[PDB]
Amino acid sequence: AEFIYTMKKVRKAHGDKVILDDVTLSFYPGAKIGVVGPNGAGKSSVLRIMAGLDKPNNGDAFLATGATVGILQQEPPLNEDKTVRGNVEEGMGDIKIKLDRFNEVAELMATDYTDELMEEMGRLQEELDHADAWDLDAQLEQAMDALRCPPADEPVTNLSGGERRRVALCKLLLSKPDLLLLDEPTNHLDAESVQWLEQHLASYPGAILAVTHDRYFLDNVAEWILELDRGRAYPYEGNYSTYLEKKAERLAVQGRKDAKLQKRLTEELAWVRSGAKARQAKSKARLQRYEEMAAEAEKTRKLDFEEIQIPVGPRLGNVVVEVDHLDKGYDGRALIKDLSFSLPRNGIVGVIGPNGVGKTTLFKTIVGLETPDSGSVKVGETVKLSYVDQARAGIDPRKTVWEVVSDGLDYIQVGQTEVPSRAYVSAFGFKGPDQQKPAGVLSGGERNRLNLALTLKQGGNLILLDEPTNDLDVETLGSLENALLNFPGCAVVISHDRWFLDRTCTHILAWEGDDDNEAKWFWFEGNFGAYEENKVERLVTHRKLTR
Amino acid sequence: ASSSRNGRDSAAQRLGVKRYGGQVVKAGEILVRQRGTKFHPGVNVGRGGDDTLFAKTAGAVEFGIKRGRKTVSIVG
Amino acid sequence: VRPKITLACEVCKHRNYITKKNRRNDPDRLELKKFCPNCGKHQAHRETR
RNA sequence: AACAUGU
RNA sequence: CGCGGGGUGGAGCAGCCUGGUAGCUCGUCGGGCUCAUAACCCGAAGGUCGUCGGUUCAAAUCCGGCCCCCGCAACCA
RNA sequence: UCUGAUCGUAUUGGGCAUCUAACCUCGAACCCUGAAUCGGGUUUAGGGACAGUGCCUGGCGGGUAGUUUAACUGGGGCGGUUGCCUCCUAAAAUGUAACGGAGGCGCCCAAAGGUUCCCUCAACCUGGACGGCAAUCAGGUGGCGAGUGUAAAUGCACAAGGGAGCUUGACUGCGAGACUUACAAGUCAAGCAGGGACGAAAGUCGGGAUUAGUGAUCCGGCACCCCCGAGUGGAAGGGGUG
RNA sequence: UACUAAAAACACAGGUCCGUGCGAAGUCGCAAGACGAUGUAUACGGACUGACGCCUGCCCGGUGCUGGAAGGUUAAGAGGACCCGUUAACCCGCAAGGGUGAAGCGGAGAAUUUAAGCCCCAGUAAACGGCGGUGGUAACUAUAACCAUCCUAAGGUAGCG
RNA sequence: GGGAUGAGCUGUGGGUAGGGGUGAAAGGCCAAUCAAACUCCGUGAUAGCUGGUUCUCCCCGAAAUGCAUUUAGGUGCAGCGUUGCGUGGUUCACCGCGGAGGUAGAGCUACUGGAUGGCCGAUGGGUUACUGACGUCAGCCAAACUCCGA
RNA sequence: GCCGCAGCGAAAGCGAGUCUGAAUAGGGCGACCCACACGCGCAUACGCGCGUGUGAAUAGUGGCGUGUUCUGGACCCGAA
RNA sequence: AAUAUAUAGGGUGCGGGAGGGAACGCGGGGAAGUGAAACAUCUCAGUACCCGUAGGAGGAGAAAACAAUUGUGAUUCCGCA
Ligand SMILES: Nc1ncnc2c1ncn2[C@@H]1O[C@H](COP(=O)(O)OP(=O)(O)NP(=O)(O)O)[C@@H](O)[C@H]1O
Ligand SMILES: Nc1ncnc2c1ncn2[C@@H]1O[C@H](COP(=O)(O)OP(=O)(O)NP(=O)(O)O)[C@@H](O)[C@H]1O
Ligand SMILES: [Mg+2]
Ligand SMILES: [Mg+2]
Ligand SMILES: [Mg+2]
Ligand SMILES: [Mg+2]
Ligand SMILES: [Mg+2]
Ligand SMILES: [Mg+2]
Ligand SMILES: [Mg+2]
Ligand SMILES: [Mg+2]
Ligand SMILES: [Mg+2]
Ligand SMILES: [Mg+2]
Ligand SMILES: [Mg+2]
Ligand SMILES: [Mg+2]
Ligand SMILES: [Mg+2]
Ligand SMILES: [Mg+2]
Ligand SMILES: [Mg+2]
Ligand SMILES: [Mg+2]
Ligand SMILES: [Mg+2]
Ligand SMILES: [Mg+2]
Ligand SMILES: [Mg+2]
Ligand SMILES: [Mg+2]
Ligand SMILES: [Mg+2]
Ligand SMILES: [Mg+2]
Ligand SMILES: [Mg+2]
Ligand SMILES: [Mg+2]
Ligand SMILES: [Mg+2]
Ligand SMILES: [Mg+2]
Ligand SMILES: [Mg+2]
Ligand SMILES: [Mg+2]
Ligand SMILES: [Mg+2]
Ligand SMILES: [Mg+2]
Ligand SMILES: [Mg+2]
Ligand SMILES: [Mg+2]
Ligand SMILES: [Mg+2]
Ligand SMILES: [Mg+2]
Ligand SMILES: [Mg+2]
Ligand SMILES: [Mg+2]
Ligand SMILES: [Mg+2]
Ligand SMILES: [Mg+2]
Ligand SMILES: [Mg+2]
Ligand SMILES: [Mg+2]
Ligand SMILES: [Mg+2]
Ligand SMILES: [Mg+2]
Ligand SMILES: [Mg+2]
Ligand SMILES: [Mg+2]
Ligand SMILES: [Mg+2]
Ligand SMILES: [Mg+2]
Ligand SMILES: [Mg+2]
Ligand SMILES: [Mg+2]
Ligand SMILES: [Mg+2]
Ligand SMILES: [Mg+2]
Ligand SMILES: [Mg+2]
Ligand SMILES: [Mg+2]
Ligand SMILES: [Mg+2]
Ligand SMILES: [Mg+2]
Ligand SMILES: [Mg+2]
Ligand SMILES: [Mg+2]
Ligand SMILES: [Mg+2]
Ligand SMILES: [Mg+2]
Ligand SMILES: [Mg+2]
Ligand SMILES: [Mg+2]
Ligand SMILES: [Mg+2]
Ligand SMILES: [Mg+2]
Ligand SMILES: [Mg+2]
Ligand SMILES: [Mg+2]
Ligand SMILES: [Zn+2]
């Protein structure tokens, strides 16, 4: 069994925060590895070593011969051409210009000399039979109907958040590399597309590495589980219910070993201050053991966790949002048609729908950044909102994380109260000298965490959150949903995490469109578990993508 | 036995005027080694990095006042 | 916090200069315009990895 | 399963 | 004298080398329960962080300067 | 013939069980043996591919062996200190000791470096929405009492201090001649050439207003140059410059 | 303690704990052998108290000793993908060079497989060891039987001073 | 003065050997020697430490400081002695001229601090019999104060 | 055989030069006779280049002495 | 012999060995003081000492050797390098 990727004595560290230290492991074809770990462990930095983007400090992390590699970054890039032209840049990347050379020589060789160009239309034709590119048009027309892509002739600027991930999954799954590097593939996707990607990654010739924070995508695609602790990597097999056992066990034995090391210090620190008696001397061997036990008691300080704390706004009145017969559409396609609801006070409203159906356009009519076609939105004089788009200003990639929350100022207003800015970003995890990290080097778990710092400093009593459960681990995801239950205003949450809307929701707004209407919604007074029961009282073959 | 924490000091840096006035020098000799510009460069004298007042031309050193600031010059 | 970095030419890939940056202030690679003795003219130098 | 006291 | 801990609400202690938001138990104060007092339940008030002089945007914390309290060494003739 | 499951022969290792023939027996009897609680042999009764021993290998190891365990010091110990920068001691050049008197340093800055151009501060006084001793504004007076990334001295208002434009000289090949110095080191340097930055030019720039922010030699690592290449062509390893 | 120390030191009879199932454990030996003992757990050896009388409290966190074997970590041996050196041949060519390179022999060798130990989970103090602070409170005063709080593996009981 | 039928005292012959013996345990004893016996050999061990080192005259003539040191009672290089060969007044004294200085002294409304007594009086304390800032008129002080200055 | 006979360079090598360097730039190390007429683009006089000298001033090596040094017990005596 | 073939052991007759010597030789075992201004690698040194075994000498000795592509042609020992 010849491998695909190997690492030998690899050590990568960003100064004090080590990512690897003397790791050595091999990736053989047919592996289905799901890599886990908390935020700051280094999961996206390992996959950029394996993609050839980054390089380790020392050690030899190389690749097998042949064996091309495709990576999905955690924020995937796109071009500025069409959707049909967005898929040909990967998977059909090098093979379209062989097709764009063979049709060139179909008229250039006729009007020119036919002896050197005879073989130039020959060795192209030898690269169209083993790769089978004679029907390259309909190979694109299949790989768009598998991921259910948006149509061919539209720009990639006015797309969804999940439609920009459906078009980026189609780039890598056409290349068919011998080593996938999926960095959070199930972000922004609905339940239909994640169920698709489970059955596609089952039958797949090649190694699959996939860093995920959820627990149900991993148990269907991964049988081996790799972990990233503070530097070390701990490979074993399981199904992520045994990951949370073994992670909580390493900290159990470490807690009552650092505690036993602590009582050895206080019995020894009492010796070094005891003062030397008559002419016998205090032993320099025991002074040297104390000065080396004090150093190993300082490279173990790991407890630093602050709860997410949402600021309370002013007192909220009886009318929060009123919507009377709302219509919204960008073309002849209609998204919202005859919608009437009224947002409650002191609840959580979950918004349900598949990709490209108008959940984010629904928020932009409430904040006023869009305009209703017919019908009105009414807010009410006590309501102060809190909302920031993902696209209109967002973050700036070379301002530091302290001057994005602040604007270079010392103290900030989080709503009729004065708090320091460095005491505010440190309440959101960014502590110590990590407050000078610019926005480009922030990871996905601390770009979602930065985005909560910008929205919640507006001090509102109606917070609108568009997918807060995006790149957060289970320690702080439970800390966020704790703070949405101690919140005395109305919170509206768009999500696709089915086991996050089942936990903290009191009202459900869901798309129940079918073939004749395609644009109707539904308001439900109750939680998500009771909406599934009420759904069945009112009221598939896997698409292949290749051949 | 109240051991004072007041013992240390730095090595002397051999500062001062190293060639005096009316004295024949070669091109490039050091005239005044000093901290800051206690003496200023006059004619045919350059300052240097640590204010060392070298010579640009062989000749005779002469000192003088030029609008308050005391200067060092070389008469070729 | 101030590591020592080596700057390499972007044409012939010789490592001509060593210097120090700040890793928190400049997380990305340093591009300067230094003089390569191999090429004989000032050319774009960039850090190594 | 609760339950001490009385110028 | 010399070392090296310590001073935080009325009493006891966290927080401190990991600078930003002063906390925990009892006690005090007002209301309940009881025939009444306890116990228990509810709501509150209370601190120049020993004093004063330095860095920082910001000090109970970091660093000096003094004032008390506690512990330990003072061995060989 | 591919991916996966399954069956079958041949082969080859790992456990477990049984066997006896290597090996083991201070169980027994007989013989050399005339005198033998030694030893060897024969047969028997048991153990058995284990144990024991060889070579390789991890652990454990004051049981034993060889040794180390600094100096200054108002005797030694205890306490303190050890290199580097700044001032007083220092007796008007330099230098100068003490467990003499005060502080710092083991960095920081991709501009807080280079260049061209422009500007002057603190404090005080009068007027002014929130505005207070003091935010920002306007006008008087003000020659250095502010400021200098960082201790202190020497300096700096002509600014080396406050602001803006473009940039990488925080260079490569050298360096006559000097300061300091036991040696080893440490420090300054006009100017010539390549190739650049800024400036209309003259010109200035081999990092920072200056002096602290560091470590000899050996042995190794890396990139580059293709210098030697143990019969010859290669390579191993050495060599040069960074 | 011949030769400045005859005692309160050592021994002792009694006590307990641990080791030993039999050419035993322990000891002298490189080994054969020997002692133990021509003895066989009421015997033999090692440790610590020291007739007798009344007694011998609490602590298993530390460090040992005994047992366990889930998990981590871990040697040689087995295994020998890939990579590098050399070159039959081939390709561009100036055959002054450059590139690709089978088989073979060598260099350096990864995944995988693998015991004790150590970390780990338990018991053990007649195992080496350890057995707390500050403040209030009663008929004049005084002292606290009593209470508050912090901490530990547990806070020095009987008796004595 | 203690034991003196007992764990007694003694004779003759025998066994245990040096990191070993033996020890009712004192580091005791092992040939007048024991925190590792004695004797030959390695061997003329080594000692930054102490002692000693022998005949004469003639010329010149020091040092006890600097830097470094597992260094401080030792040593290396310098400094100072002598001698061979080079150089020849370049050394030093005095007089004349050209130069930098911040001690002694003095000064401080020239700065940073200290500081006596008057006058004015911001604040603070009980309409103000106490506090007395900042200014101001005379008299002062300083190694880390200097407009000056031998 | 040794020392002298030519050096420079890490070394291939080149050689009264050679190494660094892009350098007919500068340096490092090494060679290199005016006190003397003439000839000598020459220069008021003085030298440069170059024949003849006015027939310039060099030099090493081996023996035996002496001073110090190296390896030996190394000036002699002395431990535990 | 036990035990059958037989061997261990036993009988008789012939030959030989043992131990000493001042040095030198060969093969095997193998220190420490000392030098490194301490010391462990290293040195002292395969020395001192010990064990086996000789000979008048001993060991080595007739190329599975060197060389550099021309050549020398068993070993020992002295001089150089
Ligand atoms: N500016 C626009 N012009 C035209 N069409 C648009 C625009 N913005 C969004 N759309 C389309 O409107 C539909 C829904 O938009 P959007 O609200 O962003 O869906 P969505 O809920 O965000 N999908 P998702 O959040 O990934 O689950 C998609 O088909 C978009 O392509
Ligand atoms: N270039 C950089 N310089 C300095 N620090 C960096 C740099 N890149 C990354 N980091 C830091 O190292 C961490 C490594 O990021 P990483 O953990 O790989 O992302 P992540 O694991 O995917 N986070 P998440 O996706 O939520 O799990 C970042 O969170 C930063 O704190
Ligand atoms: Mg990520
Ligand atoms: Mg969306
Ligand atoms: Mg000084
Ligand atoms: Mg400088
Ligand atoms: Mg920047
Ligand atoms: Mg009450
Ligand atoms: Mg005494
Ligand atoms: Mg074995
Ligand atoms: Mg020892
Ligand atoms: Mg020794
Ligand atoms: Mg001493
Ligand atoms: Mg003393
Ligand atoms: Mg002086
Ligand atoms: Mg003087
Ligand atoms: Mg200090
Ligand atoms: Mg600038
Ligand atoms: Mg400026
Ligand atoms: Mg630099
Ligand atoms: Mg020079
Ligand atoms: Mg130039
Ligand atoms: Mg120009
Ligand atoms: Mg210059
Ligand atoms: Mg500076
Ligand atoms: Mg060395
Ligand atoms: Mg060769
Ligand atoms: Mg090489
Ligand atoms: Mg060079
Ligand atoms: Mg006696
Ligand atoms: Mg006696
Ligand atoms: Mg006696
Ligand atoms: Mg007994
Ligand atoms: Mg027993
Ligand atoms: Mg035994
Ligand atoms: Mg015991
Ligand atoms: Mg006793
Ligand atoms: Mg236990
Ligand atoms: Mg055990
Ligand atoms: Mg017990
Ligand atoms: Mg008692
Ligand atoms: Mg008697
Ligand atoms: Mg008597
Ligand atoms: Mg008697
Ligand atoms: Mg005898
Ligand atoms: Mg004793
Ligand atoms: Mg004796
Ligand atoms: Mg001894
Ligand atoms: Mg000797
Ligand atoms: Mg001697
Ligand atoms: Mg004389
Ligand atoms: Mg000397
Ligand atoms: Mg004069
Ligand atoms: Mg004078
Ligand atoms: Mg002075
Ligand atoms: Mg004076
Ligand atoms: Mg004054
Ligand atoms: Mg006064
Ligand atoms: Mg003075
Ligand atoms: Mg040479
Ligand atoms: Mg030259
Ligand atoms: Mg013989
Ligand atoms: Mg030795
Ligand atoms: Mg020695
Ligand atoms: Mg010595
Ligand atoms: Mg022979
Ligand atoms: Zn280049």
CSV table of all heavy atoms in Angstrom, one decimal, chain F residues 10 20 40 43 73 103 113 123 136 154 235:
chain,number,residue,atom,x,y,z
F,10,A,P,-3.0,-28.0,1.2
F,10,A,OP1,-2.5,-29.4,1.3
F,10,A,OP2,-3.7,-27.3,2.3
F,10,A,O5',-1.8,-27.1,0.7
F,10,A,C5',-1.0,-27.5,-0.4
F,10,A,C4',-0.1,-26.4,-0.9
F,10,A,O4',-0.9,-25.3,-1.4
F,10,A,C3',0.8,-25.7,0.2
F,10,A,O3',2.0,-26.5,0.5
F,10,A,C2',1.1,-24.4,-0.5
F,10,A,O2',2.1,-24.6,-1.5
F,10,A,C1',-0.2,-24.1,-1.2
F,10,A,N9,-1.1,-23.3,-0.3
F,10,A,C8,-2.2,-23.7,0.4
F,10,A,N7,-2.7,-22.8,1.2
F,10,A,C5,-2.0,-21.7,0.9
F,10,A,C6,-2.0,-20.4,1.4
F,10,A,N6,-3.0,-20.0,2.3
F,10,A,N1,-1.1,-19.5,1.0
F,10,A,C2,-0.2,-19.9,0.2
F,10,A,N3,0.0,-21.1,-0.4
F,10,A,C4,-0.9,-22.0,0.1
F,20,U,P,4.6,-39.0,25.0
F,20,U,OP1,4.3,-40.5,25.2
F,20,U,OP2,4.5,-38.1,26.2
F,20,U,O5',6.1,-38.9,24.4
F,20,U,C5',6.3,-39.4,23.1
F,20,U,C4',7.7,-39.0,22.6
F,20,U,O4',7.7,-37.5,22.4
F,20,U,C3',8.9,-39.3,23.4
F,20,U,O3',10.0,-39.6,22.6
F,20,U,C2',9.2,-38.0,24.1
F,20,U,O2',10.5,-37.8,24.6
F,20,U,C1',8.8,-37.0,23.1
F,20,U,N1,8.4,-35.7,23.6
F,20,U,C2,9.2,-34.6,23.2
F,20,U,O2,10.2,-34.7,22.5
F,20,U,N3,8.9,-33.4,23.7
F,20,U,C4,7.8,-33.2,24.6
F,20,U,O4,7.6,-32.0,25.0
F,20,U,C5,7.0,-34.3,24.9
F,20,U,C6,7.4,-35.5,24.4
F,40,G,P,28.9,-36.5,37.2
F,40,G,OP1,28.8,-35.4,36.2
F,40,G,OP2,27.7,-36.7,38.0
F,40,G,O5',29.2,-37.8,36.4
F,40,G,C5',30.1,-37.8,35.3
F,40,G,C4',30.5,-39.2,34.8
F,40,G,O4',30.9,-40.0,36.0
F,40,G,C3',29.4,-40.0,34.2
F,40,G,O3',29.2,-39.6,32.9
F,40,G,C2',30.0,-41.4,34.3
F,40,G,O2',31.1,-41.5,33.4
F,40,G,C1',30.7,-41.3,35.7
F,40,G,N9,29.7,-41.8,36.7
F,40,G,C8,29.0,-41.1,37.6
F,40,G,N7,28.2,-41.8,38.3
F,40,G,C5,28.5,-43.1,37.9
F,40,G,C6,28.0,-44.3,38.4
F,40,G,O6,27.1,-44.5,39.3
F,40,G,N1,28.5,-45.4,37.8
F,40,G,C2,29.4,-45.3,36.8
F,40,G,N2,29.8,-46.5,36.2
F,40,G,N3,29.9,-44.2,36.3
F,40,G,C4,29.4,-43.1,36.9
F,43,U,P,20.2,-47.5,28.6
F,43,U,OP1,19.9,-48.0,27.2
F,43,U,OP2,20.5,-46.0,28.7
F,43,U,O5',19.0,-47.8,29.5
F,43,U,C5',18.4,-49.1,29.5
F,43,U,C4',17.7,-49.5,30.8
F,43,U,O4',18.6,-49.2,31.9
F,43,U,C3',16.5,-48.7,31.2
F,43,U,O3',15.3,-49.2,30.4
F,43,U,C2',16.4,-49.0,32.7
F,43,U,O2',15.9,-50.3,32.9
F,43,U,C1',17.9,-48.9,33.1
F,43,U,N1,18.2,-47.6,33.6
F,43,U,C2,17.9,-47.3,34.9
F,43,U,O2,17.4,-48.1,35.6
F,43,U,N3,18.2,-46.1,35.3
F,43,U,C4,18.8,-45.0,34.6
F,43,U,O4,19.0,-44.0,35.2
F,43,U,C5,19.1,-45.4,33.3
F,43,U,C6,18.8,-46.6,32.8
F,73,U,P,39.3,39.7,49.1
F,73,U,OP1,40.2,40.8,49.1
F,73,U,OP2,39.9,38.3,49.4
F,73,U,O5',38.2,40.0,50.2
F,73,U,C5',37.4,41.1,50.2
F,73,U,C4',36.0,40.9,50.8
F,73,U,O4',35.6,39.6,50.4
F,73,U,C3',36.0,41.0,52.3
F,73,U,O3',34.7,41.6,52.7
F,73,U,C2',36.0,39.5,52.7
F,73,U,O2',35.4,39.2,54.0
F,73,U,C1',35.2,38.9,51.6
F,73,U,N1,35.5,37.4,51.4
F,73,U,C2,34.5,36.5,51.6
F,73,U,O2,33.4,36.9,52.1
F,73,U,N3,34.8,35.2,51.4
F,73,U,C4,36.0,34.7,50.9
F,73,U,O4,36.1,33.5,50.8
F,73,U,C5,37.0,35.7,50.7
F,73,U,C6,36.7,37.0,50.9
F,103,G,P,18.1,54.5,44.0
F,103,G,OP1,16.9,54.6,44.9
F,103,G,OP2,19.1,53.3,44.2
F,103,G,O5',17.7,54.5,42.5
F,103,G,C5',18.4,53.7,41.6
F,103,G,C4',18.3,54.3,40.2
F,103,G,O4',19.6,54.7,39.8
F,103,G,C3',17.9,53.3,39.1
F,103,G,O3',16.5,53.1,39.0
F,103,G,C2',18.5,53.9,37.9
F,103,G,O2',17.7,55.1,37.5
F,103,G,C1',19.8,54.4,38.4
F,103,G,N9,20.9,53.4,38.4
F,103,G,C8,21.3,52.6,39.4
F,103,G,N7,22.2,51.8,39.1
F,103,G,C5,22.4,52.0,37.7
F,103,G,C6,23.3,51.4,36.9
F,103,G,O6,24.1,50.5,37.1
F,103,G,N1,23.2,51.9,35.6
F,103,G,C2,22.4,52.9,35.2
F,103,G,N2,22.4,53.3,33.9
F,103,G,N3,21.5,53.5,36.0
F,103,G,C4,21.6,53.0,37.3
F,113,G,P,12.8,57.6,12.5
F,113,G,OP1,13.9,58.4,13.2
F,113,G,OP2,11.9,58.2,11.6
F,113,G,O5',13.6,56.4,11.7
F,113,G,C5',14.8,55.9,12.2
F,113,G,C4',15.6,55.3,11.1
F,113,G,O4',14.8,54.2,10.4
F,113,G,C3',16.0,56.2,9.9
F,113,G,O3',17.1,57.0,10.2
F,113,G,C2',16.2,55.2,8.8
F,113,G,O2',17.4,54.6,8.9
F,113,G,C1',15.1,54.2,9.1
F,113,G,N9,13.9,54.6,8.4
F,113,G,C8,12.7,55.1,8.9
F,113,G,N7,11.8,55.4,8.1
F,113,G,C5,12.3,55.1,6.9
F,113,G,C6,11.8,55.2,5.6
F,113,G,O6,10.7,55.5,5.2
F,113,G,N1,12.7,54.7,4.6
F,113,G,C2,14.0,54.3,4.9
F,113,G,N2,14.7,53.9,3.8
F,113,G,N3,14.5,54.2,6.1
F,113,G,C4,13.6,54.6,7.0
F,123,A,P,0.9,73.3,29.5
F,123,A,OP1,0.3,72.2,30.4
F,123,A,OP2,0.0,73.7,28.4
F,123,A,O5',1.3,74.5,30.4
F,123,A,C5',1.8,74.3,31.7
F,123,A,C4',2.4,75.6,32.3
F,123,A,O4',3.3,76.1,31.3
F,123,A,C3',1.4,76.7,32.5
F,123,A,O3',0.7,76.6,33.7
F,123,A,C2',2.4,77.9,32.4
F,123,A,O2',3.1,78.0,33.6
F,123,A,C1',3.3,77.5,31.3
F,123,A,N9,2.8,77.9,30.0
F,123,A,C8,2.2,77.2,29.0
F,123,A,N7,1.9,77.8,27.9
F,123,A,C5,2.4,79.1,28.2
F,123,A,C6,2.4,80.3,27.4
F,123,A,N6,1.9,80.3,26.2
F,123,A,N1,3.0,81.4,27.9
F,123,A,C2,3.6,81.3,29.1
F,123,A,N3,3.6,80.2,30.0
F,123,A,C4,3.0,79.2,29.4
F,136,U,P,-7.2,70.1,23.8
F,136,U,OP1,-6.4,69.0,23.2
F,136,U,OP2,-6.5,71.1,24.7
F,136,U,O5',-7.8,70.9,22.6
F,136,U,C5',-8.1,70.2,21.4
F,136,U,C4',-9.4,70.6,20.8
F,136,U,O4',-10.4,70.6,21.8
F,136,U,C3',-9.5,72.0,20.2
F,136,U,O3',-8.9,72.2,19.0
F,136,U,C2',-11.0,72.3,20.2
F,136,U,O2',-11.6,71.6,19.2
F,136,U,C1',-11.4,71.6,21.5
F,136,U,N1,-11.5,72.5,22.7
F,136,U,C2,-12.8,73.1,22.8
F,136,U,O2,-13.7,72.9,22.1
F,136,U,N3,-12.8,74.0,23.9
F,136,U,C4,-11.9,74.3,24.7
F,136,U,O4,-12.1,75.1,25.6
F,136,U,C5,-10.6,73.7,24.5
F,136,U,C6,-10.5,72.8,23.5
F,154,U,P,25.7,67.4,31.8
F,154,U,OP1,26.5,68.4,32.6
F,154,U,OP2,24.2,67.6,31.8
F,154,U,O5',26.2,67.3,30.3
F,154,U,C5',27.6,67.2,30.1
F,154,U,C4',27.8,66.8,28.6
F,154,U,O4',27.1,65.5,28.3
F,154,U,C3',27.3,67.7,27.6
F,154,U,O3',28.1,68.9,27.4
F,154,U,C2',27.2,66.9,26.3
F,154,U,O2',28.5,66.7,25.8
F,154,U,C1',26.7,65.5,27.0
F,154,U,N1,25.3,65.3,26.9
F,154,U,C2,24.8,64.8,25.8
F,154,U,O2,25.5,64.5,24.8
F,154,U,N3,23.4,64.6,25.8
F,154,U,C4,22.6,64.8,26.8
F,154,U,O4,21.4,64.6,26.6
F,154,U,C5,23.2,65.4,27.9
F,154,U,C6,24.5,65.6,27.9
F,235,A,P,29.7,14.1,-9.0
F,235,A,OP1,28.6,15.0,-9.2
F,235,A,OP2,31.1,14.6,-8.8
F,235,A,O5',29.4,13.2,-7.8
F,235,A,C5',28.1,12.7,-7.5
F,235,A,C4',28.1,11.6,-6.5
F,235,A,O4',29.1,10.6,-6.9
F,235,A,C3',28.4,11.9,-5.1
F,235,A,O3',27.3,12.4,-4.4
F,235,A,C2',29.0,10.6,-4.6
F,235,A,O2',27.9,9.7,-4.3
F,235,A,C1',29.7,10.1,-5.8
F,235,A,N9,31.2,10.5,-5.8
F,235,A,C8,31.7,11.5,-6.6
F,235,A,N7,33.0,11.6,-6.3
F,235,A,C5,33.3,10.7,-5.3
F,235,A,C6,34.4,10.4,-4.6
F,235,A,N6,35.6,11.0,-4.9
F,235,A,N1,34.4,9.5,-3.7
F,235,A,C2,33.2,8.9,-3.5
F,235,A,N3,32.0,9.1,-4.1
F,235,A,C4,32.1,10.0,-5.0
